[PDB]
Structure formats: C-alpha cells, structure tokens
Amino acid sequence: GTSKLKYVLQDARFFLIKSNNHENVSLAKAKGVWSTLPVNEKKLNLAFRSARSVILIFSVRESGKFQGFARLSSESHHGGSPIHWVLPAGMSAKMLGGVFKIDWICRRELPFTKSAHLTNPWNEHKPVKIGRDGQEIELECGTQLCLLFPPDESIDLYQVIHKM
C-alpha cells in the first residue's frame, strides 16, 4: 500500500538529483550514501535541519528516467572511508567529499513519459524532469512525483518512520 509512504512524505522537502552515470546511482543504492557539489551540499544540510523528511529523487543524465528516491538520514560528513565515485570529466574528488547517509524508499525506475503532467513551480513550472542537479521540487509536485513510482515491495518503511 501507500499509507506509510504518504506518512513519510508528509511535509517533506524534495530535491532533484542528477547523476552523470548509472555507476554512482548503483553505488548509492548498495551503500546507502550520496555526495554532491558543495553548493548543493549546503542546501541539503540546511533542509535536513528544517524538515521532517528530505527526499532525493534520482535521475541519470540521458537515461530518460528516474531511478528511485531516498530520504536523508544525516547531514553531510567528511573523513569517512572514501567512496569510489565515478567523477565527471572536469572535477576532482575533493568536491564530493561531503557524504550523506540515505535510506532508500524506492529503488524502482519511472520513465519521464509518466511524469509529463507534473510541473515544478520552483523551476518556472517546467516539467519536473527538467532541472539542474540540486533543484528543489515544490511539495505538491514532489509528493505526486514520488507517488507515481511503482511500489517497491522490498522496502519496509517502518524503520524510516522511526528516524523521523
């Protein structure tokens, strides 16, 4: 069902995450971690203290789909054992030093063709698929986008609900 999922999304904040490659989303799904540019890291740290849930919605560039979504379970931290991210052409590993712990809520994909009716007021009401890495998605758009994903029956939201 969808009732526990709606409870987790209640009064959440939502951020679009754009990855240049599938390898980093696969690593994030396996290890429960994410890293982003410092500008976005500052935004996520602010949001994590401000809201009951901060939701990251993942899209690999050029894939035409979202690959799932996850809830922040910590602010960023540095100095842990380094994660072997695949780094884009012109950026170093010091940029992605801040590591967030995340709990996956859905590891299933959603094609952009299924979200074409949802627009993001915080990006000029462009379709929600459009936006830079770190773009915040307004509450109603973000909630409806998450509810479009196929249910992930492998995930038990009971443990996430406790962290809230």
Ligand X SMILES: CNC(=O)c1cc(-c2ccco2)[nH]n1
Task: Kindly list the residues in this chain that would bind ligand X in the complex (CB under 6 A).
Answer: 19-20, 24, 35-37, 85, 88, 96, 133
Tokens at 139, concatenated: 């509450």
Comparison of 42 and 114: residue with beta carbon closer to ligand X: 42
Is there a binding annotation on residue 20?
Answer: yes
Comparison of 35 and 143: residue with beta carbon closer to ligand X: 35
Helix (H, G, I), strand (E, B) or coil at 25: helix
Q: Are 26 and 107 in contact (CB under 8 A)?
A: no
Is there a binding annotation on residue 19?
Answer: yes
d(CA 79, CA 45): 17
In the chain, which residue ranges form alpha helices assigned H by DSSP?
A: 3-9, 22-31, 38-50, 139-148, 158-163
Closest contact distance (angstroms) between CB of 11 and ligand X is: 26
Is there a binding annotation on residue 122?
Answer: no
Q: Are 54 and 15 in contact (CB under 8 A)?
A: yes
Closest contact distance (angstroms) between CB of 147 and ligand X is: 25
Comparison of 65 and 114: residue with beta carbon closer to ligand X: 65
Q: Provide the annotated binding site for RNA.
A: 18-20, 34-35, 85, 133
